[PDB]
Design a protein around this ligand. Structure first.
Ligand SMILES: *[C@@H]1O[C@H](CO)[C@@H](O[C@@H]2O[C@H](CO)[C@@H](O)[C@H](O)[C@H]2NC(C)=O)[C@H](O)[C@H]1NC(C)=O
Ligand SMILES: O=C1OC2(c3cc(Cl)c(O)cc3Oc3cc(O)c(Cl)cc32)c2ccccc21
Ligand SMILES: *[C@@H]1O[C@H](CO)[C@@H](O)[C@H](O)[C@H]1NC(C)=O
Length: 547
């Protein structure tokens, strides 16, 4: 009952940590819009949490391992809360928020946010290295796995509360309470709407300050650091762990864009409902993964073989994506001739057609256009439609120049806005995609406890915190910040139309060749998986040869 009490407090701190993370990302757009700030400065401010975290994660790990640990964790949580409160003072010190079509037919105080994010990042560092090593040092024969599984399962209450109230706070006017809301002309659907972003940080800061009260009642550096980097098993494990986590990060970063470009679901069918059933599977997988290791009495090689088996069984489900793909969308003008007559070889420098010769409009324009013929037009002017239907339900343009078709003359040449959806087969395949995805997520969550349970076992009983700290540092550096950058750089090789911004020729992409997208995305993930898997198998051979 002395470890049980310490066990409760750490759960509260885990919840607070996750809440703070998801809060920060949720409030970034409003801050950019309220503060009148550049995009480079936004990329900078968002990166502060990393400058504070990566700078002191190793020193707190080593030097804090011989002081009072429960008190260090409480001090860290208090610093995190104080930093969370500091991010909301600009609102109280600045002033009031002063600021308060295109159919086109044929045409012939930021330092405060920075230094608060830095304080938060500096403050969360003592939770994982000093908490888990404390749990491992004082525990019975096999209960460390079960405890870590319960901990990782309980922590999912942070994202729930965050997503719940960050969406409720983003539908209030920013100056709520000081102004009377009856004279406000702006609505959440406008372009200048800023919500109450300062209210997201008060609740998180006070929660982090509250969750730290129970904790208050419960020359060698260099050789200790060199004695850890000459241990082969540790280096091999860290490497593969890195490869696998990089693969996961990239996949979860671009799955939502892949699903939209491949199958056609508009980020609301595939987004909201999915998570509601995707999170309990993760929680149950984590808890059961811990419970199995506890119940079956596994040693080091047993844990290694169990996690290798889970990795294999989760990689065998990943290679089924290559077999449920659809055909490529057809947009007249992009890859085919503007009159549908013939195919082309270059996405660039397609010539204008007879049906569209007279109507001189901006090619750079990208407005969804689809006629009853089934194909796609870049713009209502590029299709030749010289009529409208008013601001009613999407205005059906009519009597189109390039919508005319043989045998279609005896019909209604009228194109609705919005791309014509895919056939039924593509939906039927989307359902198989979702099923396989939840299966792979379950089988990859069943083995997430083994990393900590192995790093602790393959290292001297006194260098447990330093090892976990260096592991966390390397992973959060080379697999959380680099991972999205290279995947994104690689993916952009498959664009066929760019949104030419005022200065930058590439503001964003309109469409992407779906076949090459799937090729690059799934190939990178599969190659990384094999990479990490290989290292682990060899590692198992070395382990079995050692003991
Ligand atoms: C297709 O465009 C032609 C030429 O603009 C339209 O021709 C006339 O449009 C007005 C109003 O409908 C009237 O002069 C006649 O009803 C149309 N016929 C002609 C040639 O005089 C035509 O209406 C358009 N497509 C439709 C709706 O039939
Ligand atoms: O970023 C994430 O990576 C994984 C993930 C994270 C950990 Cl620690 C783990 O132990 C397993 C794991 O499994 C997957 C598998 C995937 O196919 C994708 Cl596409 C993301 C994640 C994940 C699961 C649930 C929410 C977010 C993530
Ligand atoms: C389109 O089809 C329906 C029925 O014929 C009606 O809207 C009208 O007669 C046709 N012409 C257009 C473009 O509205």
């Amino acid at each position: 009952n002395g470890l049980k009490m310490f066990l409760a407090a750490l759960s509260l701190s885990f919840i607070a940590k996750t809440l703070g993370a998801i809060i920060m990302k949720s409030s970034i757009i409003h801050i950019e819009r309220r503060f009148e700030i550049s995009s480079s400065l936004v990329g900078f401010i968002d990166g502060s949490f990393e400058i504070g975290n990566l700078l002191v994660i190793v020193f707190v790990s080593y030097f804090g391992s011989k002081l009072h640990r429960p008190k260090l964790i409480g001090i860290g949580c208090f610093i995190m809360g104080i930093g969370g409160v500091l991010t909301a003072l600009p609102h109280f010190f600045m002033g009031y928020y002063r600021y308060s079509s295109t159919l086109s037919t044929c045409l012939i105080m930021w330092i405060y946010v920075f230094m608060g994010n830095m304080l938060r990042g500096i403050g969360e560092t003592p939770i994982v290295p000093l908490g888990l090593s404390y749990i491992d040092d004082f525990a019975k024969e096999g209960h460390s796995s079960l405890y870590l599984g319960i901990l990782n399962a309980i922590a999912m209450i942070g994202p729930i509360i965050g997503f719940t109230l960050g969406s409720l706070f983003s539908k209030m006017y920013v100056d709520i309470g000081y102004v009377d809301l009856s004279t406000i002309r702006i609505t959440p659907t406008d372009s200048r709407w800023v919500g109450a972003w300062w209210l997201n940080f008060l609740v998180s800061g006070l929660f982090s300050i509250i969750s730290s009260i129970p904790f208050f009642f419960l020359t060698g550096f260099f050789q200790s650091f060199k004695s850890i980097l000459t241990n082969p098993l540790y280096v091999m494990f860290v490497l593969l762990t890195l490869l696998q986590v990089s693969s996961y990060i990239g996949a979860f970063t671009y799955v939502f864009k892949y699903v939209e470009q491949q199958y056609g679901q508009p980020s609301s069918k595939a987004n909201i409902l999915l998570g509601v059933i995707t999170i309990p599977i993760f929680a149950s997988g984590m808890f059961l993964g811990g419970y199995i290791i506890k119940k079956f009495k596994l040693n080091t090689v047993g844990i290694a073989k169990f996690s290798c088996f889970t990795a294999v069984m989760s990689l065998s489900f990943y290679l089924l994506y290559f077999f449920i793909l659809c055909e490529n969308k057809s947009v007249a003008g992009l890859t085919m001739t503007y009159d549908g007559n013939n195919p082309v070889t270059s996405h660039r420098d397609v010539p204008l057609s007879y049906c569209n010769s007279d109507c001189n409009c901006d090619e750079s324009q990208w407005e969804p256009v689809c006629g009853n013929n089934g194909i796609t037009y870049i713009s209502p002017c590029l299709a030749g439609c010289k009529s409208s239907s008013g601001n009613k339900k999407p205005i059906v343009f009519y009597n189109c120049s390039c919508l005319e078709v043989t045998g279609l003359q005896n019909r209604n040449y009228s194109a609705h806005l919005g791309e014509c959806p895919r056939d039924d087969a593509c939906t039927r395949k989307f359902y198989f995609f979702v099923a396989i995805q939840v299966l792979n997520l379950f089988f990859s969550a069943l083995g997430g406890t083994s990393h900590v349970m192995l790093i602790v076992k393959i290292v001297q009983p006194e260098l447990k915190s330093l090892a976990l700290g260096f592991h966390s540092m390397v992973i959060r550096a080379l697999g959380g910040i680099l991972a999205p950058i290279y995947f994104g750089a690689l993916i952009d090789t498959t664009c066929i139309k760019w949104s030419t911004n005022n200065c930058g020729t590439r503001g964003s992409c309109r469409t992407y060749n779906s076949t090459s997208f799937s090729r690059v995305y799934l190939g990178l993930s599969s190659m990384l998986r094999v990479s990490s898997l290989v290292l682990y198998i060899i590692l198992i051979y070395a382990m079995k040869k050692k003991y």
